[PDB]
Amino acid sequence: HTFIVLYVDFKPKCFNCYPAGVNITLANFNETKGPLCVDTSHFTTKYVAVYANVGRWSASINTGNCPFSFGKVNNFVKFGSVCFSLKDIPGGCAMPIVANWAYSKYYTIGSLYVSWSDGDGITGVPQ
Amino acid sequence: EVQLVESGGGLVQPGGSLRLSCAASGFNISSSYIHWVRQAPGKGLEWVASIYSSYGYTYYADSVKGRFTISADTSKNTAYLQMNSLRAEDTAVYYCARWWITFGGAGGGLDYWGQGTLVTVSSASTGPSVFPSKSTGCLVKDYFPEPVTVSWNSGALTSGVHTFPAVLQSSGLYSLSSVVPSSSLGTQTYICNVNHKPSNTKVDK
Amino acid sequence: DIQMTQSPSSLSASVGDRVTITCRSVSSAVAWYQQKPGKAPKLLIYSASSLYSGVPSRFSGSRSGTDFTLTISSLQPEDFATYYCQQGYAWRNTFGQGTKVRTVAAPSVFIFPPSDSQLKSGTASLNNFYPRALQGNSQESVTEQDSKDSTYSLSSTLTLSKADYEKHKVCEVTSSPVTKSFNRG
Ligand SMILES: *[C@@H]1O[C@H](CO)[C@@H](O)[C@H](O)[C@H]1NC(C)=O
Ligand SMILES: *[C@@H]1O[C@H](CO)[C@@H](O)[C@H](O)[C@H]1NC(C)=O
C-alpha cells in the first residue's frame, strides 16, 4: 500500500507556551504539484509525534470540519480516492492540530486538509 | 447567461508573447477552478494549466511550466493566460474551462467549456479571394492562416450544406469551399458571407 | 505522477453496435467527454460513476481494478464524436490518445467552371455519399461524417492557371466512372 504519515513537531513566563515548531510535514508533498493523492487501492493513515511529548504536554488531531478523525481513515471506509495536503482544499474539510501546554490551555498549530472523491471506490488500511 | 468566453488569440512570431482572456458570466470564477486545454490541429486534447482564482492556486503542466503563466481578476470575473517564448509545438486552439468540485475535494470534473480560440506560431505573412446545371458554391483561395467563417445570407438558412476544410497549398497558403435547391434558383438572391479574421477580409460576394 | 493509455484510437462501427472505449496506479477520479471536430467538447461522465443531468443514458462508465471503461448501449447517428478519457483531480488534467467514432448511398458529382473575376489574375479552376487526361495534382478535400446522414463530401480543386488557357477544354469516381467534365463555349 501507501503510507500517509503526518509528522507533528514542536520545541517548547509560560516558557513552553508558543512552541515554534513548524516541521509539520507530509510524505513527498510537493505543494505546487498538488495534494498527495492516493493512487494505490490501499493506504495506511499514520500519525507521528516528533514533538517531545513531555509529561506536561500532549497533542491531538480531532477535526470538526471533517467526518472522520485521523486514524478512523485506517478503518475500512467508503472512499473513491483521497488526497492529503497541508494547504486548503476547496470543497473539502480541515483538521486542527491543537497543542496543550497542559489540560489548562490549548492552541492550534497547523491544519490537515484532505480531498475526497465519490462513493466507495477505494478503502483504507489499518495495518 | 452562463458563458465562458475565450479571446485574445491570433498569429504570433517565434518566441513571441500573447495573452488569452477567459471571461465568464452566469457564475463567479473564484467559486470554481478554471483550466486551460490546448488542442493541436489534427491532434487530441493536451493538458495545460489550471487555477483556483479565489485562493490563487496556480497549477501547471509538464511542458508549459516555465513559459506560460496563469492569473485571474475576480473583480473582472476573468481568467488570463500569458504565453511567452512560443514554438510550433504550442500553436493550437486553446479552450478555457470550468472545473466544479464534488461535495468532497476531488472535484466532479471539468464542467463547462468555451468555443476556444486558435493561436498560430508562425513567421509567415498574412488576403483571400472569393470566386464561385450539372445534375439533380463560394470558393476561398489564398488565405493564411485559419480560421475562415462561411455562411449564407448571414446565417439565414443552411440545411444540408457541407463545408470543406482548408486545402493545404504546398507554398503555404490555404483554400477551401462550401455549397442544393434544384427548382428555385431565381427565387431570392443567395449570397455567401466569408470572413478571414487575421487578414480582415469580409465582403459578401 | 501517473499516465493514461487509451485504445483503440479509431473505432468505426455501425448503428446499434456497442462501442467499448477503455483506458488504463489509478482511483475513482476519471471522466469521459465527446467532441465534434473543431467544436467544443461536453462533459459526459465524471468520476466513472454517474452522468451529467441531461446526458443520454446510453453512455455508461465504470471501472474494474486499473481499467476504466465507457460503453454506449445503442449507438445513435448523433453519437459521432472523438471520445476522450481524462484522469486526475481539480488541479491535474491528463488525457489519452483519443478514440474516434453505414448504409451505402449515391454520390451526385458537380463541378463548376472558373469565374471571370478569377481569370484577370491568371488562374482558373461530391455530396452525401457513404462509401470511401489523368494526373493527385488537382487537389481534393474531405469532410467529416454527417450527423444523421453519416455521409461525407469531397471536392475537385482544379489547381490550374491561365498558362493552360486553351490547353484542355475537357470527373473521376470509382461502376461507371462519371465523366461530367464539360467543355468551354
Ligand atoms: C523535519 O523532519 C524530517 C524527518 O526526516 C527531516 O528530514 C527534516 O530535515 C526536518 N525539518 C526541519 C527540522 O526543519
Ligand atoms: C517538486 O518537484 C520539483 C521537480 O523538478 C523539484 O525540483 C522540487 O524540489 C520539488 N519540491 C518539493 C517541495 O517537493
CA C138 to chain centre: 23
State which residues form the domain around A121: 1-127
Which residues numbered 58-77 in B keep a CB inside 8 Å of some CB on A?
59
By the 10 Å C-beta count (0-12 exposed, 13-18 middle, 19+ buried), C47 is classed as buried
Q: Is C173 on the interface with A (CB under 8 A)?
A: no
* Dist CA A112 CA A86 (whole Å): 5
Does the domain formed by B129-204 have CATH 3.40.50.970? no
CB contact at 8 A, B99 and B34: yes
**Domain boundaries defined on chain B:** 3-121, 129-204
Query: Which candidate, B201, B28, B11, places its Cα nearest to that of B112?
Result: B28
Does the domain formed by B3-121 have CATH 1.10.1740.10? no
Beta-carbon contacts of residue A88 (< 8 Å; ≥ 6 apart): A94, A111, A113, B55
- The CA R_g of chain C, rounded to the nearest whole Å, is 23
Could you tell me which residues are beta bridge partners of residue B80? B21, B71
Could you tell me which residues are beta bridge partners of residue C139? C157
Which residues numbered 44-83 in A keep a CB inside 8 Å of some CB on B?
80-81, 83
Checking DSSP bridges between strand B129-131 and strand A43-49, what pairing results, if any?
unpaired
Could you tell me which residues are beta bridge partners of residue A93? A114
- State the residue for C-alpha cell 434558383: B185
- State the residue for C-alpha cell 476504466: C68
Determine whether the interchain pair A90/C25 forms a contact, defined as Cβ–Cβ distance below 8 Å: no
* Dist CA A93 CA A65 (whole Å): 5
Q: Kindly give the distance from the C-alpha atom of residue A30 to the centroid of ligand 2, in angstroms, as a whole number.
A: 6
Determine whether the interchain pair B165/C139 forms a contact, defined as Cβ–Cβ distance below 8 Å: no
Q: Considering the domain C5-100 in this protein, what is its CATH number?
A: 2.60.40.10
- Residue A127, ligand 2, Cβ within 6 A: no
Which DSSP string corresponds to A85-96? ESS--TTSEEEE
Could you tell me which residues are beta bridge partners of residue B176? B140
* Dist CA A100 CA A89 (whole Å): 26
CB contact at 8 A, B82 and B17: yes
User: B3-121 with B129-204: one CATH topology?
Assistant: yes
Chain A nearest CA to B69, separation (Å): 14
CA C69 to chain centre: 22
Query: Which candidate, A87, A19, B169, B32, places its Cα nearest to that of C90?
Result: B32
CB contact at 8 A, C168 and C182: no
**How many domains does chain A fold into?**
1
Which DSSP string corresponds to chain B? --EEEEE--EEE-TT-EEEEEEEEESS-GGGSEEEEEEE-TTS-EEEEEEEETTTTEEE--SSSSSSEEEEEETTTTEEEEEEES--TTT-EEEEEEEEE--SSTT--EEEEE---EEEEE--S----EEE-------EEEEE-SS-EEEEETTTT---S--BPPP---TTS-EEEEB---SS-SSSS---EEEEETTTTEE---
- The CA R_g of chain B, rounded to the nearest whole Å, is 20
| Plot region of C64 (φ>0 → left; ψ -120 to 50 → alpha; else → beta) | beta
Instruction: Verify cis geometry, omega within 30 degrees of 0, for the bond prior to B145.
Output: yes
Q: What is the dihedral of CA B42, B124, B82, B111, to 10 degrees?
A: -20
* Dist CA C131 CA C144 (whole Å): 13
